[PDB]
Design a binder for this molecule. Sequence first.
Ligand SMILES: CC[C@H](CNC(=O)CCC1CCCCC1)Nc1ncnc2[nH]ncc12
Length: 167
Amino acid sequence: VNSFSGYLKLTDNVYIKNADIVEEAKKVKPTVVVNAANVYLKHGGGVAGALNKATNNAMQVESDDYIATNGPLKVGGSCVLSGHNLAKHCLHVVGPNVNKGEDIQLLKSAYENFNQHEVLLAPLLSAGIFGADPIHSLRVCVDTVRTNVYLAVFDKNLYDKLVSSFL
Ligand SMILES: CC[C@H](CNC(=O)CCC1CCCCC1)Nc1ncnc2[nH]ncc12
């Protein structure tokens, strides 16, 4: 038993809710919140900009130190950093950005990072400003992640569509 409320169960291990991930994180305080990161951990907009704003820019300060030490992430890769006031940990995961021409096949690799964590609160990778089809992203999620994932979908209209079209 865990503290997530109001989710619709899609599969054995995947759940979905129309929610603002920042507010969900603020209430649940999950062990892991997933950020929709880029390779530079520049949290300017989308999910990342919202999460970072909610940390009063502490996420960005920590991220800049990480990059200065380690260099950029790989597309499809991840790193674990602090969750600040939102979660114990933040798993920064880089899905491909279609608006940058990156290979959508890397979306499966991106979701594989979730399997290193028993339970996660997450957005749909490569959705939103990353330019992928959120329905495809949901399919890859369901077919790749084996751990327990609670997906927060900000847009109510999108949410209805994802549910109604789910196979
Ligand atoms: C990481 C990508 C996801 C995609 N899913 C969305 O719902 C985005 C809203 C529209 C989706 C349909 C039209 C474009 C925007 N983006 C977020 N997912 C959860 N929470 C969030 N907060 N801010 C962004 C965001």
